[PDB]
Amino acid sequence: SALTQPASVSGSPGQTITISCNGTSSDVGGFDSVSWYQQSPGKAPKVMVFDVSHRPSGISNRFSGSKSGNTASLTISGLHIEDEGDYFCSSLTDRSHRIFGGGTKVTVLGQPKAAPSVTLFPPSSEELQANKATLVCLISDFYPGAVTVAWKADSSPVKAGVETTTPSKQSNNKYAASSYLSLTPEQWKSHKSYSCQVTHEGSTVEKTVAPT
Amino acid sequence: QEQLVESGGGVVQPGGSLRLSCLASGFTFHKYGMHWVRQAPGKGLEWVALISDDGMRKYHSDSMWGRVTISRDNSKNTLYLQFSSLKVEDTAMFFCAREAGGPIWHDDVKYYDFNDGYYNYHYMDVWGKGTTVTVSSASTKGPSVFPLAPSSKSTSGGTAALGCLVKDYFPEPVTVSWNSGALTSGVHTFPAVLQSSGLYSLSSVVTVPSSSLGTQTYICNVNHKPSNTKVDKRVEPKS
Numbered sequence: 059s060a061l062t063q064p065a066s067v068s069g070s071p072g073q074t075i076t077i078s079c080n081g082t083s084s085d086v087g088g089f090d091s092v093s094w095y096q097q098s099p100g101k102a103p104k105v106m107v108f109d110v111s112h113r114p115s116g117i118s119n120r121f122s123g124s125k126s127g128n129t130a131s132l133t134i135s136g137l138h139i140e141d142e143g144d145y146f147c148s149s150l151t152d153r154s155h156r157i158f159g160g161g162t163k164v165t166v167l168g169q170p171k172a173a174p175s176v177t178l179f180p181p182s183s184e185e186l187q188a189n190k191a192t193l194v195c196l197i198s199d200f201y202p203g204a205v206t207v208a209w210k211a212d213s214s215p216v217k218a219g220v221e222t223t224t225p226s227k228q229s230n231n232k233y234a235a236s237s238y239l240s241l242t243p244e245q246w247k248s249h250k251s252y253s254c255q256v257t258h259e260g261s262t263v264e265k266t267v268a269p270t
Numbered sequence: 271q272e273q274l275v276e277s278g279g280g281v282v283q284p285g286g287s288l289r290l291s292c293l294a295s296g297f298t299f300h301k302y303g304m305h306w307v308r309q310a311p312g313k314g315l316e317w318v319a320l321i322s323d324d325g326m327r328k329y330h331s332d333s334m335w336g337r338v339t340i341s342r343d344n345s346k347n348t349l350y351l352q353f354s355s356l357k358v359e360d361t362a363m364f365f366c367a368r369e370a371g372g373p374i375w376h377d378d379v380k381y382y383d384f385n386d387g388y389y390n391y392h393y394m395d396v397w398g399k400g401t402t403v404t405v406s407s408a409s410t411k412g413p414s415v416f417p418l419a420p421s422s423k424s425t426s427g428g429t430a431a432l433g434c435l436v437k438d439y440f441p442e443p444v445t446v447s448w449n450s451g452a453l454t455s456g457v458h459t460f461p462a463v464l465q466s467s468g469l470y471s472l473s474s475v476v477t478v479p480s481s482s483l484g485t486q487t488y489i490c491n492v493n494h495k496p497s498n499t500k501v502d503k504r505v506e507p508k509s
């Protein structure tokens with residue numbers, strides 16, 4: 059089980075952004091025990107907000123928490139460079155458990171947004187002769203560093219054999235990611251086409267390869 | 271100066287047992303509840319278990335019940351997490367988190383629980399940096415290197431993308447260079463992925479002028495110091 063959060067939220071320095079956290083009556087809607095955690099790269103998570111709207115000692119007044127029914131919200135006013143990271147909501151359960159949300163990557167825009175460049179490679183003849191097949195989807199030069207990758211065999215989607223990396227900075231401050239679809243040489247020749255579909259900031263790029 | 275330091279993590283084989291530890295300092299350990307929180311690679315925080323101050327009340331997530339056991343030694347300021355029969359899917363960072371607690375206030379009067387106990391505040395106030403558990407059956411293995419050939423599909427007008435697929439290796443450190451280091455401009459080596467096999471795979475790409483395809487030779491120099499394997503592969507365009 060998991061509370062529901064948007065995958066990516068972004069804003070310019072000084073702007074005000076909001077992160078939603080959808081739960082149920084046995085958690086978020088059941089108690090006033092919603093807490094928020096910030097996780098910076100290479101750093102331990104830290105409490106930002108607890109008991110819906112309360113701030114611990116040393117936490118900036120720019121972080122505020124709110125709740126309406128089964129939904130909790132974290133608001134960040136006057137967005138700062140140091141607020142970048144992953145934000146997780148948590149709640150107490152009616153079973154005395156703790157449930158966390160999926161997380162939200164918060165980007166404080168420091169350069170213009172860029173859509174990804176998608177290059178899809180079919181299995182090489184060298185790999186096919188080794189009785190293996192891998193479709194390689196390279197996603198590069200996008201900003202912010204959050205994308206959704208989906209594969210299709212013909213027009214139907216495929217979740218088996220898919221491995222996607224988490225975006226990482228590509229030296230020039232933009233992010234890159236890669237996704238692989240592992241098949242047997244037989245599966246590869248059994249379907250008419252294969253597609254890698256990449257979604258970034260609501261826009262989508264789809265490249266298609268065929269056994270040729 | 272309240273601290274939590276995790277230990278016990280590393281590379282372990284599936285079906286095996288594993289004990290994680292977490293040493294607390296800068297606070298009176300026995301007065302507080304303690305949690306274990308995991309984070310699978312590129313994934314979110316996931317609550318594992320909670321143990322009461324006295325170690326008498328234990329709660330485990332449904333995804334972990336039967337696999338893990340939480341315990342504590344209030345004389346040694348230590349928290350534990352014991353694994354029986356590890357699974358390749360148990361691969362994650364394990365965080366130790368203190369449950370915030372103290373007295374309940376009512377009309378400027380401090381109220382404690384039975385036997386000077388603290389009440390839980392329902393938030394995790396102190397966190398450790400984590401200990402990583404990597405479940406893999408694999409032994410040292412060198413990679414298989416395949417070309418990701420340039421074609422019209424990888425040509426973005428002026429330039430063209432080409433790469434090297436570095437498949438099924440173990441353990442983690444693989445290094446990729448292009449044209450013996452003479453090519454560094456446009457090079458990106460993606461992080462490795464840990465397949466169901468227990469082996470890693472990675473890709474390295476380079477952007478070159480479309481004019482050079484047919485004239486310039488491009489070679490990826492793959493390095494696997496743990497298996498003492500070096501592979502130099504020339505990625506040339508196909509027909």
Ligand SMILES: *[C@@H]1O[C@H](CO)[C@@H](O)[C@H](O)[C@H]1NC(C)=O
Nearest residue numbers: 062063064065078079080129
């Ligand atoms: C959660 O629910 C609210 C309203 O109940 C909605 O407006 C929002 O888009 C949802 N957020 C997520 C992450 O699903």
